[PDB]
Design a protein around this ligand. Sequence first.
Ligand SMILES: [K+]
Ligand SMILES: [K+]
Ligand SMILES: [K+]
Ligand SMILES: [K+]
Lengths: 410, 409, 408, 410
Amino acid sequence: NALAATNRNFKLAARLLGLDSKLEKSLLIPFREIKVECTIPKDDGTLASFVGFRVQHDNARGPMKGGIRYHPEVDPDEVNALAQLMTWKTAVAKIPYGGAKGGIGCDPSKLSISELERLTRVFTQKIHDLIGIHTDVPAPDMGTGPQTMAWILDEYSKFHGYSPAVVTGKPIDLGGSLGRDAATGRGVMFGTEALLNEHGKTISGQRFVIQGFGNVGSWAAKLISEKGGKIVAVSDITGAIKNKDGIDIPALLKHTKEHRGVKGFDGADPIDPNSILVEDCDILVPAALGGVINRENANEIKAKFIIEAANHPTDPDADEILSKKGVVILPDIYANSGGVTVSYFEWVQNIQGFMWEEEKVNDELKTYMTRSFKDLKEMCKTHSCDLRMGAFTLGVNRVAQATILRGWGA
Amino acid sequence: ALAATNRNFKLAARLLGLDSKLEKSLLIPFREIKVECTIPKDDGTLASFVGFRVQHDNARGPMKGGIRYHPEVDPDEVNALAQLMTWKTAVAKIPYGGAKGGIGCDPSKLSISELERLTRVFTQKIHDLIGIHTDVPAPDMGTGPQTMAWILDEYSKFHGYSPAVVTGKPIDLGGSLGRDAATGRGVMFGTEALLNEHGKTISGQRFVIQGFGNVGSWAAKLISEKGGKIVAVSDITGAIKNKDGIDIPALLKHTKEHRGVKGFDGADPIDPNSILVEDCDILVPAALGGVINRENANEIKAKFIIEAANHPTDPDADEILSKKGVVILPDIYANSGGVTVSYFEWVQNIQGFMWEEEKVNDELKTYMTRSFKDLKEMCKTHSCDLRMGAFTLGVNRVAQATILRGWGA
Amino acid sequence: LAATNRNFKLAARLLGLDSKLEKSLLIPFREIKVECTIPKDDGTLASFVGFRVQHDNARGPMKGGIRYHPEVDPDEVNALAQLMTWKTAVAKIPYGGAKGGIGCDPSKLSISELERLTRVFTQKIHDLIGIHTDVPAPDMGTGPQTMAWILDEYSKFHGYSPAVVTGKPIDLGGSLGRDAATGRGVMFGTEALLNEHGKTISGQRFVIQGFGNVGSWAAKLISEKGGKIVAVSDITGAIKNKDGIDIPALLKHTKEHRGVKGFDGADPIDPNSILVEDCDILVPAALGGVINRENANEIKAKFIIEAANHPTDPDADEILSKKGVVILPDIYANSGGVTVSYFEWVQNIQGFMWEEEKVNDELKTYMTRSFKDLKEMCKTHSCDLRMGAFTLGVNRVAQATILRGWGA
Amino acid sequence: NALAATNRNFKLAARLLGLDSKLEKSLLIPFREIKVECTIPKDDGTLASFVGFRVQHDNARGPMKGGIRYHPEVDPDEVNALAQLMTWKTAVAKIPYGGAKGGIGCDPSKLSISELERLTRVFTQKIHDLIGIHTDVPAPDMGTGPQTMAWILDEYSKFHGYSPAVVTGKPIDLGGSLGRDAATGRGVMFGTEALLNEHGKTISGQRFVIQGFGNVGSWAAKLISEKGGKIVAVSDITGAIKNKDGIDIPALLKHTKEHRGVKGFDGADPIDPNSILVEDCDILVPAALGGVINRENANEIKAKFIIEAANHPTDPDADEILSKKGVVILPDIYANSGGVTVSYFEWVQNIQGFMWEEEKVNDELKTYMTRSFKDLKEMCKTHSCDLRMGAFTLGVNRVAQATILRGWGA
Ligand SMILES: [K+]
Ligand SMILES: [K+]
Ligand SMILES: [K+]
Ligand SMILES: [K+]
């Protein structure tokens, strides 16, 4: 209900710009769509056939970037929307990538680790000629992780020699970047301060509600509290906890790693899991799932700021409700761009054959996100639009310019 | 009768002892590609088209399949034809796999300069996905030898001169002699093979040929030259009959002059809808699919039907004509002379040395008789009709190569 | 071992070969060792060494088998690779000599492990071989399926490459007549040898020691050319018939059973006396060094066809050299195999398979020409057949080496 | 030779870690071993045939690195040991290389410069397909030098285009690195300060005896005196000299370069050339050859610290004797790693197409060696072992982790 909106925002941005319909159509059509057969022997000896795939949407601004999703549900339209979304996101970030997205229709929880490596290596064999250091650089996604990237790297290197830059999100021992783990969360804290400063405020003192406590949410909470932010409520799959005076995030993290959830945490009262988004605060950070803010609860949001750390957490219905209430929303396409930005930095480090210290990684991230927020701000002033539309017009403009500069045939 | 393809495959897999897991893998195509083809039109404005190529199976060698320029593109049909080509090349005993591709577009609305432009972009967008030993495209609806010349030309910018990358080229650019008559000549070859098995020969037999294009005319020419009596021929302009035999050479001059058979002295005109039920020995549907169907199958008087066209017999008519004792030479074999000679064109390009036409035709006789022998022996093995014998033979060969090559332990 | 090197220096001195050029001809072009580590079926790791000696490629791509065997003597492997270089030159096929394998016991591995290992080996050497570089073939412990796996795995790195290996299944581009190739070659050379002496295969009495893949095929085609196969031995025992063993009937018996011992139509004889049987033509077809000091004087044949490799070590060579026993050397006699393996490659290069009659007809052409070239070397240097073969082969490699030059 | 101890140290380190015996077996086996025929025309026209070779031991952690030896003595076992040592050495240094080692069995002192170029190019032609920018990067060694590398670079570039990164040790005019001459000596001084700092000490004031005065030894004395180190005794090819207040190193360096030895230096009294190891001081630097410290001279060593600047300078017996005395030994695998580390920097600069100023080379060298020393120490803390074993365990562990992360197929 918010991802079908991708094409809508695009067409909206294209109309904000003076985009010609013929160029718009070209930008909509992906550069390449690939489906491959992945047949492996299972541990019981019998054959198992899976379909791997890769949508390579756009490469005008450089090599394509996108995750590999191991998930049984594969909608052709949905995957295409994500590949296109990555094209604008990389453009908003001003990193020299295009957008792509791939995966294998499969359920990893029903495969042995032996089968998952076997499956991953076959998939790499079937697409090795379609990706590459300067063509398409995959990344982890739902159902895959650093070990997956390691296996891809190993098999790919058999066909083209050692190629650490062919995937990002690798283990540190295999050429992964420092700061990759904290990247998206750190970006969320960075972008929040940029937006607050634009209103004469700073993170220090503000009250935060963080819905979701996975990698992104947990890191956000850590770095934000370290900036003086008052984290008053946090939820995860195990429950939701509140502390009006501020949750001690270091203590929570220590509890959360040991106990595998925020539930049972001494030092914060448990609260109704369905009250977390409507809890009283200044800044609301949806950091788990999509569609959690909708027509059913938009009027009950109390924050003046919503930092879309998760993807598509706010449906179009809630978007217009909160606008007509003075709520500013930092759109996900910008708010969580620290991840893909740092992945660009990982690739750069591999291209340069020399890793950066973490202070440099983080320093460049601050620079890239400061600049992109400024450009994002100026697009809004130019087109008298909200932040989300400013991000899409900014992204579509850059792709369109690069496309035009490179030309079509004769 | 086209969507019936999976029916023939699923049956053949059951006639063979194929494991259900291996059967599913054989159904899954090796690769499916969609590419953006945007070109500047003659007026300067942009035009965007989608090109595509389904590469179904390559167990038995490089993939082979036509390129279709047509605005209507059904994904299932494209996949079905690619799968069909996999079985057909296996029946032919030529070392290819099956593929099928094209661009969704209407060439009648494009200038010739735009069509070259569009063809070159498509080649640039897929050149890394085809190749001398990978995938050898060929013409199909909306493309022809000129299109192949353009592909050859653009592909060679990326890989050096590569005449073997496409078949159906002009003779001047390494196309094969005998390429025009190949399908038609193959039909006559398969007819004699089938008749020889019944102690009969072409000489004397009465032929009805529905459709008089390249395939139909060539069959009529070469069959009449073997002593066959063509008693009726129909085409887009009408149908003409002569119970004592139509003089094909004279008819060919009339049809080349008058762009149709209607008006030919030496054959009375007859109802174009009556052509399939005319009295004869051998009926050659050579125009369209499904022309022999549930409504007219019982009314066929021929003891043999030579499927020169593709899918001329619906499953319904297959059983009616089977029980009435009609032997049907199935399309997958009967018109394989074309794909066989396209293999010969490629072989000649691979060997850097063209064949005399007599060699082309002589190898074709060898390839189609030997494949008929194997086709015959499969039917006896499984007590099945020719069409089912062909699918089981084709699926068995691919399965053998797939199993020999393995799935990485 | 050093058995080969002994013939080589002898041939090198027969020709006027420069000692420095001779040293280079002896040194192999390349020696490769690679680690092949696979997970075993129980999950634990297993590490094997693969290897390939690439001896000489002056005359074209190198050719040689892959042997899966636990015993790996570096001296043997180099000797075999060097021998292949000479063998391909006597055959006049445009190949050089190479030889490789994996130290492992295939009898202790599942087919899953054997496939895994084969593919890993291919990954480890794919960049060191190729359709125009080095074309492997089956050998001890490998067969057509092994070639199929190599073909499949190699093709992931370089596209479909049927010509990268020979000995493939026919379903994957293997040659017709490949199975009978070596056996037919021995029959061809026997007729050439007899024709030089005013005799023909027809009428001559054959005792055939060994009835494996090669021996069985030899017996078949000679019986069909009128040869009287009067005694045959193999791993299970020996049978004799002065009027001739019916090779089809013998083949029927052996195909049902696992040996000829029990064959109606030939009474059994002593398994170790076959070499000393009364006949005109004796064919050692099993193992090396079997013709030796202990039984050389008791050979009654005037003709010995070396179907096996190194069946006569130097000791018997000189004993039989006197008294007039003719020996057709292994380097030529079993070259039918490597010749038809060349034809398999040619067919794959041409993308168009040959009828079997063409394979066999070209086989007859290539071996006749090489025999004629072989005899003239013997006449030129007043030497026996074995040295004549070495002189011919080493001459061809040296000529090719010199024409191509050394930079300068 | 403490060279044959290589397999000795490894199986120990592999046992200190929980290394599966089968994985230990694979880590022992080299990835590839190559022998090639190198036949060239000599200047008199006659043929000469040589055998070139390259052991490529391990590449789990990256491209292989190793020297090319032009030397008539070729022991296969020793060459394999050296390539294996390099695998561990690069892992301790934390540079992304594996270990290799090669050469040509030949005596360059019996060859003209024209024949040496001919032979060098023929060797490159025979192995060009087995090395590469991301595969295996050779370097000078005994019998080869910058000119050798220039010829390799030139001939290789005919086959793969300009490839300055294919070898290190190049002439500076062809992309060689600044500071490469002082690298090993400077590295010795860096590690010495790192070691002393853990003991609350600094280079300043302490007494140095430096045995051997080659490239490494001379540079060490130079850099050490400049930090305040008191070099009280020096040995070289011509003899040994002493000065209880400290030998004036700048003045001596002037004396040694003109005269080509230390024999004759005003400002330092001569001493027994065979007494050099038993001189009283704080830090003794064996900097010439291996096995110079053995059981016969171990008990009377007066230093609390031995900086193994040379390779294999301490035999196993003395290692335990000096441990049983409170003597700390900085092992050669770490102490002289400045060379290989800067060779990595040379490669990096060529990969990036942009040379570093010398100060940057030296600052990065300091960074890499302090970081590796800190890592080396924490390994000792975990395994309660000496510095030498701490280095092997650290290197073997890193290789083992990379190997496992990349996996084995199925
Ligand atoms: K596009
Ligand atoms: K398939
Ligand atoms: K040689
Ligand atoms: K290893």
